Ligand binder design. Structure first.
Ligand SMILES: *[C@@H]1O[C@H](CO)[C@@H](O[C@@H]2O[C@H](CO)[C@@H](O[C@@H]3O[C@H](CO[C@H]4O[C@H](CO)[C@@H](O)[C@H](O)[C@@H]4O)[C@@H](O)[C@H](O[C@H]4O[C@H](CO)[C@@H](O)[C@H](O)[C@@H]4O[C@H]4O[C@H](CO)[C@@H](O)[C@H](O)[C@@H]4O[C@H]4O[C@H](CO)[C@@H](O)[C@H](O)[C@@H]4O)[C@@H]3O)[C@H](O)[C@H]2NC(C)=O)[C@H](O)[C@H]1NC(C)=O
Ligand SMILES: CCCCC/C=C\C/C=C\CCCCCCCC(=O)O[C@H](COC(=O)CCCCCCCCCCCCCCC)COP(=O)([O-])OCC[N+](C)(C)C
Ligand SMILES: CCCCC/C=C\C/C=C\CCCCCCCC(=O)O[C@H](COC(=O)CCCCCCCCCCCCCCC)COP(=O)([O-])OCC[N+](C)(C)C
Ligand SMILES: CCCCC/C=C\C/C=C\CCCCCCCC(=O)O[C@H](COC(=O)CCCCCCCCCCCCCCC)COP(=O)([O-])OCC[N+](C)(C)C
Ligand SMILES: C[C@H]1CC[C@]2(OC1)O[C@H]1[C@H](O)[C@@H]3[C@H]4CC[C@@H]5C[C@H](O[C@H]6O[C@@H](CO)[C@H](O)[C@@H](O)[C@@H]6O)[C@@H](O)C[C@@]5(C)[C@@H]4CC[C@@]3(C)[C@@H]1[C@H]2C
Ligand SMILES: C[C@H]1CC[C@]2(OC1)O[C@H]1[C@H](O)[C@@H]3[C@H]4CC[C@@H]5C[C@H](O[C@H]6O[C@@H](CO)[C@H](O)[C@@H](O)[C@@H]6O)[C@@H](O)C[C@@]5(C)[C@@H]4CC[C@@]3(C)[C@@H]1[C@H]2C
Ligand SMILES: C[C@H]1CC[C@]2(OC1)O[C@H]1[C@H](O)[C@@H]3[C@H]4CC[C@@H]5C[C@H](O[C@H]6O[C@@H](CO)[C@H](O)[C@@H](O)[C@@H]6O)[C@@H](O)C[C@@]5(C)[C@@H]4CC[C@@]3(C)[C@@H]1[C@H]2C
Ligand SMILES: C[C@H]1CC[C@]2(OC1)O[C@H]1[C@H](O)[C@@H]3[C@H]4CC[C@@H]5C[C@H](O[C@H]6O[C@@H](CO)[C@H](O)[C@@H](O)[C@@H]6O)[C@@H](O)C[C@@]5(C)[C@@H]4CC[C@@]3(C)[C@@H]1[C@H]2C
Ligand SMILES: C[C@H]1CC[C@]2(OC1)O[C@H]1[C@H](O)[C@@H]3[C@H]4CC[C@@H]5C[C@H](O[C@H]6O[C@@H](CO)[C@H](O)[C@@H](O)[C@@H]6O)[C@@H](O)C[C@@]5(C)[C@@H]4CC[C@@]3(C)[C@@H]1[C@H]2C
Ligand SMILES: C[C@H]1CC[C@]2(OC1)O[C@H]1[C@H](O)[C@@H]3[C@H]4CC[C@@H]5C[C@H](O[C@H]6O[C@@H](CO)[C@H](O)[C@@H](O)[C@@H]6O)[C@@H](O)C[C@@]5(C)[C@@H]4CC[C@@]3(C)[C@@H]1[C@H]2C
Ligand SMILES: *C(=O)c1ccc(-c2c3ccc(=[N+](C)C)cc-3oc3cc(N(C)C)ccc23)c(C(=O)[O-])c1
Ligand SMILES: *[C@@H]1O[C@H](CO)[C@@H](O[C@@H]2O[C@H](CO)[C@@H](O)[C@H](O)[C@H]2NC(C)=O)[C@H](O)[C@H]1NC(C)=O
Ligand SMILES: *[C@@H]1O[C@H](CO)[C@@H](O[C@@H]2O[C@H](CO)[C@@H](O)[C@H](O)[C@H]2NC(C)=O)[C@H](O)[C@H]1NC(C)=O
Ligand SMILES: *[C@@H]1O[C@H](CO)[C@@H](O)[C@H](O)[C@H]1NC(C)=O
Ligand SMILES: [Mn+2]
Lengths: 113, 149, 438, 253, 6, 85, 33, 196, 50
C-alpha cells in the first residue's frame, strides 16, 4: 500500500526560547547597585582619601585638562562602540584621540609627579 | 514560487532559521483542445533535507483562465540550518507525473541579529555593574592625581 | 520599406564557400539602370538572422582595384553600396560583392564517434533574394567533398548537380524580386574542429621607460562540432593515437597562435595554474590544453608575450611628444570565429589621447583610468573598444591612436616615488624627535 | 660543524620539503587536469562525492560541491561515504542517490606507481564503515582465505564486487596488449576476466596517466526495470531465451 | 606528513 | 581620418628609448648602493647628539637626495625584474 | 628567471656568510669584553 | 565573520564563521590591502598567500633573537636567530606555498614568550598586557594556543614551589591571566571553553 | 579510527630527529643541563618547555 497513497502531514516541533526574569527584581538589583556606587563616592569624599590638594596650576593645568580629556575621551569612544558604532570608525577615532592625547598625557605625567 | 511572507523575494534577503515563508504553484489540464484549471485536493508540498521536515497539503488560492493556483499558507522554517529542498511531487495514477524542485540554503542567525543586551531584563543588573565600575574608575583616576601625600 | 527599383540585374552568380568554419559568399552582379534619373546607390538584401550574423561586408568593381563605400543599414535588412561617379540612365555596371558571416552548419547527426567523419546541415535561401528583379541567375557551392540535399523538392529545376568539389544549381532565367520563399537545406562533410571564442579580452600595455609592448589575451573557447556518443574513453583515444591516425579530426588537440615577429617571454596559463605543454617556434606559439576539446566542451585560458615598442609606436614630426601607435586587433589561431571582443590599450600615466580610429566598425569605445604597479597618481589611461562578430584572418586591420606624452609626465613617475619615500623619511624623523617619558 | 649544518639544512630543504602535492615531478599533472575538467564541463550546482582527503582541493580547484573534506567534524557522514565506496554498486547507488550526488571521483596509481591511491586507503574506509555499521561491512571479507589482501584472480568475491574495485580497474587489462596488466603499486597481475562491469555508473573522464577517474551516476529507467537487468539485457542474446512457465511474483497491490 | 589518510 | 593617420604613422621615425633595457640592471645596482650610503648617513645624523636646528637641516638635505636616488633605482630595478612601469 | 642550481648556490652563500659573521661577532664580543 | 557556505558537507552545510580561526586570513587580507592602497602595488591575492610564510620567517628569527637575548645575551640571540632561520624542522611547514595555520603561529608564539619573560623578571604591567594581546592574536590564529595556556602557569607554579615568589610574579601573572582570558573568549570558535 | 588514520598524528622514529636538526640535537640536552647549573626563573621556563 506504499508508493501509491497519500501520506499524512508533518509539522516541525520548535524548541523553547529562554525565560526572562520579571522586571521588578532586576529593578531592585539595579537600585542596590546605584546605592552601592553612591556609597563608594561619598566614602571617598568623607575620608581624606580624596582631598583635592595637589591641583595643578599655571601651564601644568592645561596639560592636566588634556590628560583628563584623553581619559574621558576613550571611555566615550567605548560607549559609542556599545551603542552601535562600527569597529573601523572606532579604531579611527581611537587613533585620532590617542596621538595627541598620548603626547599631552606623557607631558603631564612628566611635569607633575 | 516561494517567497517571504511579507513578499520579499529570496534574492533580496536569503532565508534564515525560523523565518516565515509562502509557497505557491499552479496546475492546468489538457482535455484535447484547451488548457483548463485542474482541481485536486491531495497535492502536497515537502521541505526536505534528506528526510521530510515539512509535509503540507495545498489549498486552492485563486483561479486564472487556464490554471488553478494552490498555496501553502504561511509557515515557519525549522530552527535547523542547512541546504533544504522545496519539492512538489504530484504522482497520481492515471495522470501525468509532475515534479518541481528548488534547492535553497537556510542560514543561521548572524551576530547582529540577536536581541541587544539592553532588551533582556536579566542583563540589566550586569550592565549597571559595568557602568558603575567605569564611572568609579574615572573618579578614582582624577582623585588619584589631585591628592598629595 | 523597400528601396525604389531604379536598377535591374542582367546576371546573378552566387558562390557559397564552406571550406572554413564560417560562410563566405561572393556575388557576381551585372546591373543596369532602368529609370532616367541618375542614381549612385545600390541596395543589398539580407534576412534578419543573416544580418545579425554578418561579420564582414565589402564590394568593388570587376575592373577596378579599389573598394566602394559599402555600409550596412540599421523584415529584410539592407546594405548600401555608393557609386563614386553617377551612371547614365541606361548603362552597364559590373559589381563583385563579398561577405563573411559568423554562422556555420550544425552537425546533422548530433552525436558521432571519436573517429567517425562529421557532416553539417546548413540552410539558406535557394533563389536569389533581392529587391531588384533579375533576368538571369545561378548558384554554386564549393569547399567540401560531398554535397547532398535534405528533403529535396519534386521540381527538377529546383535541384543541383555535382562537379569536382562543387555543386552547381539551376540556371534560371527570370526571377521576380523578393522571391525568397523556397529554402534549401544542404548537408556537407566538414571533418575539422569548429572553434568558437565566446569572449576575448585582449590587453595591450605600452611602457616608455622599458620600451616594451606587452600582450595579454584571455580566451574562452568552445568546440561546436558533433558531440561524442558513448562519452569519453581515454583508452579509445590512446588506441587512436598509437595507431598513428593523424587524420583530420573534429576535436582540438593543439592550437597554433600566430604572433608578431620578434616576440619574447611567452607564457600560457589557465584559471587553475600554469600549463607546461607549450612550445615556441619562429613567429608561432603551439599550445596543448590540459584535456582535448571535444564537441561541446569549454576551455578558458590565457596567453601572453612581449615585443619591442619601436615596431608599433612612432613619433610625430612636429614635436617629440606626440606619438602614433598602430596596434593589431587580432593575434590568434588560424581558423577561428569571435563573438565578443573587448580590446583594451593602456597608455602611461600622463598621456592625453588626441585622436582615435578603427579600421572596422566597433560597437563601443570608452576611455577611463586604471591603477597599476607604481601608479601612485590616477594611473594608466585605458582605452577600450568593443566589437561583436570578428573572424580570424579577415579582420587583419590595425587600430590607430595618436596621443601626447610630454617629458614632464615621463619624469614625474620617479618623482612621485621619491615624494613617497621622502614623506616616510620625514615621518621617521618626526617619530624620533619627541619623548614619551614619564 | 656550523658550516656542515648549513649544507645539511639546504640539502634537506631542496630534497624533501620543496614539492607540491598537486603536481608530481618526473611533469605529471593529473589532479589539475581532472579538476579543471570538472570546473569547465559540469553544471555549476553539481555535487561530487569522493574520499575526504580530496575535499578541500576540489572545493578549491574544481569549485564544485562536496560531501566531506579535511575538516572532519562529522564522522557519520564520512562513514556514509566510505560505506558507499565499499558496497556493491546497487547499495552504493541507493546511498549516493539519497544524497543527490552526481559525480564520483577516484584516484588510481596502478599505472605509474603512485602509491597514495584509493585502494591503499580502502581498508581504512572499510574500518570506519564497520565502526558505524558492524553487521553490514566486514573487513574480514576483503581478505583471502589465507589472510592476504590481493587484487589479482585470487581476490575475495566481496573485494571484486565493491564499487572502488570496479571503478579503479575498469578497462585496465585492455590497456596492455594481450590482456595482462601489472599493478605497479601492488605487483599483482590483472586479467580481463577479473573486473566485472558497472551497470549504475558511467565513466566520464580519465586523466592521461589514469590517476584520476570521474564517473557519473546514470539516471534511472523510465520503465522501472533495475539497472542490473538493463545491463544483463544488453550483455545477452540467446536464441532459446527462456521457458513459457510462470513468474513467482506476489499479489498485486 | 599531512592531513590525509595513510 | 583613418587615411591621414595611416599616412602619418607610415611616414615617421620609430621610437628611440631613453635608456636601453639591457643597461638598466647596472644602473639599478649602482643607484641602490648610492641610496644605501646616503640614507644610512642620514640615520647617523639622526643619532647625532648635536643641536636640533642643524640636525633638521642635515637630515632634510640628505633625505631630499636619497629619495631622488631611491625613486630612480626603484624604476630601474622594477624594469629589470620584468615588471615594466 | 633564476635557475635551480643558481638558487641553491645563493641560499648556500647566504648561509655561509651569515655563519661567518655571527662567528666574528661572537669572537669580538667574547674577546673585547 | 558570518559566512555560511552551502558548498561543503552538502546536505548539512557548515557555519564557517564560528568554526574557524580567522587570524591568518585577516592578516593576509590586511597585507593585501596595505600593499594595494598605501604602497600602490596591486599584488595578486594568490601571490600574497603564497609568499606569506617566507615573509614571517624573518619575524620569527628576530623574535627568537630577542627571546634568547632575554635568556643569556645578544651573541646567543644571534646564534639562535641564525639557527631558526634555516633549520629544516621549521622549514618543513613554512615553505613558500604552505599557507597553513602554522605559517604565522610559530611567529606569534615566540613573540608572546618574549614579552612574558620581560614581564616575569621586571614586573611590568605593560609587558604583561603586550603578552596578553599577542596571546589573543595567537588564540585567533591557531588552535595550539592551549600549549601557552598551560606553559605560563606551570612556570609560575614551579617558581612557587622553589620558594621564589615575588610581587613581580603576582603583577605579571595576574595581569596576563585576567586580560588574556577575558580576551580569548571573544573568538567564536573558542567561546566559553577557557572556563569549562 | 579517524584520528588513527591521518599520517600527521603518528609517533616518530629516531632518524627524523636528526633529519630535522643536524647537530642541534645533541647540543639541546647539553644546553638544558647547562641551564640547570645556573638556575634563574627564565631558565626554569626554558627547562619546562624543553
Ligand atoms: C552528521 O551526519 C549524520 C549523517 O548524515 C547526521 O545523522 C542524521 O541525523 C538525522 C537527524 O538530523 C537522522 O534523521 C532522524 O532519524 C531519527 C531516527 O530514525 C531511525 O529510527 C526510527 C524509529 O524511531 C525509524 O523509523 C527510522 O527509519 C530510523 O531507522 C528519526 O526519528 C527522525 O525522524 C523525525 O524527523 C524526520 C524529519 O526531521 C521526520 O520525517 C520524521 O517523521 C520524524 O519527525 C518527528 O520528529 C521531528 C523532530 O525530530 C518532529 O518535528 C516531527 O513532527 C515528528 O515528531 C513526531 O514524532 C516524534 C517521534 O519521532 C514524536 O516524539 C513527536 O511528538 C511527534 O509525534 C529523523 O529521520 C538521520 O537518521 C541521521 N543519519 C545517520 C546515518 O545517522 C547528523 O545529524 C550529522 N550531525 C550534525 C549535522 O550535527
Ligand atoms: C586604549 C586602546 C583600546 C583599544 C584596544 C584594542 C584592542 C583590544 C584587544 C583585544 C580585543 C578583542 C575583542 C575585539 C574584537 C573586535 C573584532 C570585531 O570588531 O568584530 C565585531 C563582531 O565580530 C565578532 O565578534 C567576531 C570576533 C572577531 C575575531 C577577531 C578577528 C581576528 C583578528 C585578529 C587580529 C588581527 C591583527 C590585525 C591584522 C594584522 C564586529 O563589530 P561591528 O563592526 O559589528 O560594530 C558593532 C559593535 N557592537 C557589536 C558592539 C554593536
Ligand atoms: C631587509 C633585508 C632583505 C634581504 C633580501 C630578502 C630577500 C632576497 C633573497 C632572495 C630572493 C631571491 C629572488 C630571485 C629573483 C627572482 C626573479 C629573477 O630571477 O630576476 C631575474 C633578473 O634579475 C636581475 O637581473 C636583477 C638585476 C639587479 C636588480 C636590481 C637590484 C635589486 C634591488 C632590490 C630592492 C630594489 C628597491 C630599491 C629601493 C631603494 C630574471 O629576470 P627575467 O628574465 O625574468 O626578466 C624579464 C626579461 N627582461 C630582463 C628582459 C625584462
Ligand atoms: C605591509 C607589509 C608589506 C611587506 C613588503 C613591504 C614592502 C616591499 C613590497 C614589495 C617588494 C616586492 C615584492 C614582490 C612579491 C611578488 C612576487 C610574485 O608574486 O612572484 C610570483 C612568482 O614568483 C616569482 O616569479 C619570483 C620568486 C621570488 C620572489 C621573492 C619575494 C621576496 C620577498 C618575500 C615577501 C614579499 C612580500 C609578501 C607579499 C607579496 C608571480 O608569479 P605569477 O605566476 O603570478 O606571474 C608570473 C609572471 N607571468 C605570468 C608573466 C609569467
Ligand atoms: C556604555 C555604558 C554607558 C551607556 C549605557 O550603559 C553602558 O549604555 C546605554 C544604552 O544606549 C541604553 C539605551 C539603549 C537605547 C534605549 C532606547 C529606548 O527607547 C527606544 O525604544 C525603542 C523600542 O521600544 C523605540 O523604537 C525607540 O524609538 C526608543 O528610542 C529607551 O527606553 C532606553 C534606551 C535609551 C537605553 C537606556 C539606557 C542606555 C542609555 C545605556 C547606558 C546606561
Ligand atoms: C562632556 C560630555 C558631552 C556629551 C557626551 O559626553 C561628554 O558626548 C556625547 C556624544 O556626542 C554622544 C552622541 C554621539 C552620537 C550618537 C548618535 C546616536 O544614534 C544612534 O542611535 C542608536 C539607537 O539609539 C542606533 O542604534 C545607532 O546606530 C545610532 O548611531 C544617538 O542615539 C546618540 C548619540 C547622539 C550620542 C549620545 C551620547 C552623546 C551625546 C555623548 C555624551 C555622553
Ligand atoms: C551608579 C551607576 C550604575 C547605574 C547606572 O549608571 C550609574 O545608572 C543606571 C540606569 O538605571 C540604567 C537603566 C535605566 C532603566 C533602563 C530601562 C530600559 O528599558 C526601556 O526599554 C524600552 C523598550 O521597551 C522602553 O520603551 C522603556 O520604557 C524602558 O524603560 C533599558 O533599556 C535600560 C535600563 C535598564 C538602564 C540600564 C543601564 C542603567 C542600569 C544605568 C547604569 C550605567
Ligand atoms: C641587497 C639585497 C637586494 C639585492 C639582492 O638581495 C640583497 O642581491 C641581488 C643579487 O645581485 C642577485 C643576482 C645575482 C646575479 C644573478 C645573475 C643571473 O644572471 C643570468 O643571466 C646572465 C647574466 O650574465 C647569464 O646568462 C647567467 O649569469 C645567468 O643565467 C640572474 O638570473 C639572477 C641574478 C641577477 C641574481 C638575482 C637576484 C639578485 C639581484 C639579488 C637581490 C635579491
Ligand atoms: C666575509 C665573507 C667574505 C668571504 C666569504 O664569506 C665570508 O668566504 C667565502 C667562501 O669561500 C664561500 C664559498 C665556499 C665554497 C662554496 C662552494 C659551493 O659550491 C659547491 O660546493 C660543493 C662542495 O660539496 C657542493 O657539493 C655543491 O652543492 C656546491 O654548489 C658554492 O655553492 C658556495 C661556495 C662557493 C661558498 C660561497 C660563499 C663564499 C664564496 C664565501 C665568501 C662570501
Ligand atoms: C569554578 C568553576 C567551576 C564551575 C563553573 O565554572 C566556574 O561554573 C559553572 C556554570 O554553571 C556554567 C554554565 C552556566 C550555563 C551556561 C549556558 C551557556 O549556554 C549559552 O550557549 C551559547 C552557545 O554559544 C548560546 O548562544 C547562549 O544563548 C547560551 O546562554 C553555555 O555556553 C555555558 C554554560 C553551560 C555555563 C558554563 C559551564 C558551567 C557549568 C560552569 C562551571 C565550569
Ligand atoms: C609526509 O608524510 C612526508 C613528507 C616528505 C616525504 C619525502 C618526499 C616527499 C616528496 C618528494 N618529492 C615528490 C620531491 C620527495 C620526498 O623525499 C623524501 C626523502 C626523505 N629522506 C631523504 C629520508 C624523507 C622524506 C621524503 C615523505 C615521503 O617519504 O614520501 C612523506
Ligand atoms: C569559461 O568560459 C565560458 C564561456 O564564456 C563560460 O560559460 C558561460 O558561463 C556562464 C555562467 O556559468 C553562463 O551563463 C553562460 O551561458 C556560459 N556560456 C557558454 C557559451 O557556455 C564559463 O562560465 C567560464 N568558466 C569559468 C570557470 O570562468
Ligand atoms: C559604451 O561604454 C560602456 C562600456 O564599458 C557602456 O556604458 C557604461 O557601462 C558601464 C558598465 O556597467 C556602466 O557602469 C556605465 O554607467 C555605462 N555608462 C557610462 C557613461 O559609462 C556602454 O556599453 C556604452 N555606453 C554608451 C554607449 O553610452
Ligand atoms: C474563475 O472563477 C471561478 C472559480 O472560482 C469560475 O467562474 C471560473 O473558474 C473562473 N472564472 C472566470 C470568469 O475566469
Ligand atoms: Mn593544518
Amino acid at each position: 500500500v506504499d508508493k501509491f497513497g497519500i501520506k499524512p502531514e508533518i509539522h516541525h516541533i520548535f524548541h523553547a526560547e529562554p525565560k526572562r526574569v520579571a522586571k521588578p527584581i532586576a529593578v531592585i538589583f539595579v537600585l542596590i547597585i546605584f546605592i552601592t556606587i553612591l556609597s563608594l563616592i561619598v566614602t571617598w569624599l568623607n575620608s581624606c582619601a580624596a582631598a583635592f590638594n595637589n591641583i595643578p596650576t599655571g601651564v601644568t593645568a592645561v596639560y592636566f585638562l588634556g590628560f583628563i580629556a584623553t581619559i574621558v575621551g576613550f571611555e566615550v569612544i567605548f560607549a559609542r562602540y556599545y551603542l552601535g558604532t562600527s569597529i573601523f570608525e572606532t579604531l579611527f577615532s581611537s587613533l585620532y584621540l590617542g596621538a595627541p592625547g598620548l603626547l599631552t598625557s606623557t607631558k603631564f605625567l612628566r611635569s607633575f609627579g | 514560487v516561494h517567497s517571504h511572507a511579507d513578499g520579499t523575494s529570496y534574492d533580496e534577503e536569503p532565508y534564515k532559521i525560523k523565518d516565515k515563508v509562502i509557497y505557491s504553484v499552479g496546475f492546468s489540464e489538457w482535455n484535447g483542445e484547451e488548457w483548463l484549471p485542474h482541481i485536486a485536493d491531495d497535492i502536497q508540498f515537502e521541505l526536505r533535507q534528506v528526510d521530510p521536515y515539512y509535509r503540507l497539503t495545498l489549498s486552492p488560492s485563486g483561479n486564472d483562465s487556464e490554471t488553478q493556483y494552490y498555496t501553502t499558507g504561511e509557515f515557519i522554517l525549522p530552527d535547523r540550518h542547512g541546504v533544504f529542498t522545496f519539492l512538489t511531487d504530484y504522482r497520481k495514477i492515471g495522470l501525468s507525473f509532475t515534479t518541481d524542485k528548488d534547492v535553497k540554503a537556510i542560514r543561521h542567525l548572524a551576530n547582529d541579529e540577536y536581541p541587544r543586551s539592553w532588551e533582556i531584563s536579566n542583563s540589566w543588573v550586569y550592565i549597571s555593574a559595568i557602568c558603575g565600575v567605569i564611572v568609579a574608575w574615572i573618579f578614582f583616576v582624577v582623585s588619584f592625581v589631585t591628592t598629595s601625600s | 520599406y523597400e528601396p525604389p527599383a531604379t536598377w535591374e540585374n542582367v546576371d546573378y552568380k552566387r558562390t557559397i564557400d564552406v571550406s572554413n568554419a564560417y560562410i563566405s559568399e561572393t556575388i557576381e552582379i551585372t546591373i543596369k539602370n532602368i529609370a532616367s534619373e541618375p542614381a549612385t546607390e545600390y541596395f543589398t538584401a539580407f534576412e534578419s538572422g543573416i544580418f545579425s550574423k554578418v561579420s564582414f561586408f565589402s564590394a568593388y568593381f570587376t575592373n577596378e582595384a579599389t573598394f566602394l563605400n559599402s555600409q550596412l543599414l540599421a523584415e529584410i535588412r539592407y546594405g548600401i553600396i555608393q557609386f563614386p561617379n553617377a551612371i547614365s540612365p541606361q548603362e552597364e555596371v559590373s559589381l563583385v560583392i563579398k561577405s563573411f558571416y559568423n554562422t556555420v552548419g550544425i552537425p546533422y547527426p548530433e552525436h558521432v564517434g571519436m573517429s567517425e567523419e562529421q557532416h553539417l546541415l546548413w540552410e539558406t535561401n535557394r533563389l536569389p533574394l533581392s529587391a531588384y528583379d533579375t533576368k538571369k541567375a545561378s548558384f554554386t557551392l564549393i569547399g567540401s567533398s560531398s554535397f547532398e540535399e535534405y528533403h529535396p523538392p519534386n521540381d527538377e529545376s529546383l535541384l543541383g548537380k555535382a562537379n569536382g568539389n562543387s555543386f552547381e544549381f539551376g540556371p534560371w532565367e527570370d526571377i521576380p524580386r523578393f522571391s525568397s520563399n523556397e529554402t534549401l537545406a544542404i548537408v556537407y562533410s566538414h571533418n575539422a574542429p569548429l572553434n568558437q571564442v565566446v569572449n576575448l579580452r585582449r590587453d595591450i600595455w605600452l611602457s616608455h621607460w622599458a620600451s616594451t609592448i606587452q600582450f595579454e589575451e584571455y580566451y574562452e573557447l568552445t568546440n561546436k562540432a558533433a558531440k561524442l556518443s558513448k562519452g569519453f574513453s581515454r583508452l579509445e583515444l590512446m588506441k587512436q593515437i598509437q595507431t598513428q591516425n593523424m587524420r583530420q579530426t573534429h576535436f582540438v588537440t593543439v592550437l597554433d597562435m600566430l604572433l608578431p615577429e620578434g616576440a619574447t617571454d611567452h607564457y600560457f596559463t589557465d584559471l587553475v595554474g600554469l600549463v607546461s605543454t607549450s612550445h615556441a617556434e619562429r613567429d608561432h606559439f603551439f599550445i596543448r590544453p590540459r584535456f582535448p576539446i571535444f564537441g561541446g566542451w569549454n576551455y578558458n585560458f590565457t596567453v601572453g608575450w612581449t615585443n619591442k615598442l619601436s615596431d608599433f609606436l612612432h613619433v610625430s614630426s612636429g614635436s617629440d611628444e606626440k606619438f602614433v601607435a598602430s596596434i593589431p586587433i587580432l593575434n590568434g589561431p588560424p581558423d577561428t570565429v569571435y563573438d565578443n571582443v573587448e580590446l583594451s590599450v593602456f597608455l602611461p600615466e600622463g598621456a592625453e589621447i588626441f585622436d582615435i580610429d578603427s579600421p572596422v566598425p566597433f560597437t563601443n569605445v570608452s576611455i577611463e583610468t586604471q591603477k597599476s604597479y607604481f601608479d601612485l597618481n590616477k594611473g594608466h589611461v585605458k582605452l577600450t573598444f568593443s566589437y561583436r562578430n570578428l573572424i580570424s584572418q579577415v579582420a587583419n586591420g590595425q587600430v590607430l591612436i595618436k596621443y601626447d606624452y610630454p617629458k614632464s609626465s615621463f619624469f614625474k613617475k620617479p618623482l612621485s616615488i621619491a615624494c613617497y619615500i621622502f614623506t616616510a623619511l620625514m615621518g621617521v624623523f618626526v617619530l624620533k624627535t619627541l619623548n614619551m617619558n614619564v | 660543524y656550523l658550516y656542515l649544518f648549513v649544507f645539511h639544512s639546504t640539502w634537506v630543504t631542496r630534497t624533501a620539503y620543496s614539492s607540491p602535492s598537486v603536481v608530481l615531478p618526473s611533469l605529471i599533472d593529473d589532479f589539475r587536469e581532472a579538476y579543471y575538467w570538472l570546473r569547465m564541463n559540469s553544471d555549476e550546482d553539481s555535487k561530487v562525492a569522493a574520499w575526504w582527503d580530496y575535499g578541500y582541493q576540489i572545493g578549491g580547484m574544481a569549485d564544485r560541491t562536496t560531501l566531506v573534506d579535511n575538516n572532519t567534524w562529522n564522522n557519520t557522514h564520512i562513514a556514509i561515504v566510505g560505506k558507499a565506496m565499499a558496497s556493491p554498486e546497487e547499495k552504493s547507488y541507493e546511498i549516493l542517490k539519497e544524497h543527490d550526488v552526481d559525480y564520483v571521483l577516484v584516484i588510481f596509481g596502478g599505472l605509474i606507481g603512485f602509491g597514495g591511491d584509493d585502494i591503499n586507503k580502502f581498508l581504512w574506509m572499510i574500518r570506519i564503515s564497520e565502526g558505524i555499521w558492524p553487521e553490514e561491512i566486514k573487513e574480514r571479507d576483503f581478505y583471502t582465505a589465507e589472510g592476504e589482501y590481493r587484487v589479482d584472480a585470487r581476490a575475495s568475491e566481496t573485494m571484486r564486487n565493491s564499487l572502488l574495485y570496479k571503478m579503479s580497474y575498469k578497462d585496465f587489462p585492455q590497456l596492455f596488449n594481450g590482456g595482462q596488466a601489472t599493478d605497479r603499486v601492488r605487483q599483482q597481475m590483472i586479467t580481463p576476466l577479473d573486473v566485472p562491469p558497472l551497470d549504475y555508473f558511467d565513466e566520464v573522464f580519465t586523466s592521461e596517466n589514469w590517476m584520476v577517474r570521474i564517473y557519473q551516476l546514470k539516471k534511472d529507467d523510465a520503465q522501472g526495470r533495475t539497472l542490473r537487468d538493463v545491463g544483463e539485457l544488453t550483455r545477452s542474446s540467446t536464441k532459446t531465451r527462456r521457458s513459457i512457465k510462470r513468474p513467482e511474483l506476489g499479489l498485486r497491490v | 606528513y599531512a592531513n590525509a589518510t595513510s | 581620418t583613418y587615411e591621414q593617420l595611416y599616412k602619418e604613422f607610415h611616414s615617421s621615425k620609430s621610437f628611440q628609448p631613453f635608456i636601453h633595457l639591457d643597461t638598466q640592471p647596472k644602473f639599478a645596482i649602482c643607484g641602490l648602493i648610492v641610496t644605501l650610503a646616503v640614507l644610512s648617513s642620514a640615520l647617523f645624523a639622526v643619532g647625532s647628539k648635536s643641536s636640533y636646528i642643524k640636525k633638521l637641516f642635515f637630515y632634510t638635505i640628505l633625505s631630499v637626495i636619497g629619495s631622488l636616488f631611491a625613486g630612480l633605482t626603484t624604476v630601474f630595478a622594477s624594469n629589470s625584474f620584468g615588471v615594466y612601469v | 628567471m633564476i635557475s635551480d642550481e643558481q638558487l641553491n648556490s645563493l641560499a648556500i652563500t647566504f648561509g655561509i656568510v651569515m655563519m661567518t659573521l655571527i662567528v666574528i661577532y661572537h669572537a669580538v664580543d667574547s674577546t673585547m669584553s | 565573520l558570518n559566512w555560511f557556505d552551502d558548498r561543503t558537507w552538502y546536505p548539512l552545510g557548515r557555519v564557517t564563521g564560528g568554526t574557524l580561526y580567522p587570524g591568518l586570513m585577516t592578516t593576509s587580507a590586511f597585507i593585501w590591502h596595505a600593499l594595494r592602497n598605501w604602497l600602490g602595488l596591486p599584488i595578486d591575492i594568490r601571490n600574497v598567500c603564497v609568499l606569506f610564510a617566507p615573509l614571517f620567517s624573518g619575524v620569527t628569527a628576530w623574535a627568537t633573537y630577542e627571546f634568547t637575548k632575554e635568556i643569556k645575551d645578544a651573541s646567543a640571540g644571534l646564534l639562535a636567530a641564525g639557527f631558526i632561520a634555516i633549520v629544516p624542522g621549521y622549514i618543513s611547514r613554512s615553505v613558500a606555498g604552505s599557507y597553513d595555520n602554522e605559517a604565522i603561529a610559530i611567529t606569534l608564539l615566540m613573540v608572546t614568550f618574549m614579552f612574558w619573560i620581560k614581564a616575569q623578571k621586571t614586573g611590568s604591567i605593560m609587558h604583561a598586557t603586550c603578552a596578553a594581546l599577542f596571546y589573543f592574536y595567537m588564540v585567533s590564529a591557531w588552535g595550539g594556543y592551549v600549549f601557552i595556556t598551560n606553559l605560563i602557569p606551570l612556570h609560575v607554579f614551579l617558581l612557587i614551589l622553589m620558594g621564589r615568589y615575588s610581587s613581580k610574579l603576582y603583577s605579571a601573572y595576574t595581569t596576563w591571566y585576567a586580560i588574556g582570558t577575558v580576551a580569548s573568549m571573544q573568538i567564536p570558535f573558542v567561546g566559553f571553553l577557557p572556563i569549562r | 579510527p579517524i584520528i588513527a588514520s591521518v599520517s600527521e598524528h603518528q609517533p616518530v622514529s629516531w632518524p627524523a630527529f636528526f633529519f630535522d636538526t643536524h647537530f642541534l640535537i645533541w647540543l639541546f640536552p647539553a644546553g638544558v643541563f647547562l641551564l640547570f647549573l645556573d638556575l634563574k626563573d627564565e631558565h626554569v621556563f626554558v627547562i619546562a618547555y624543553s
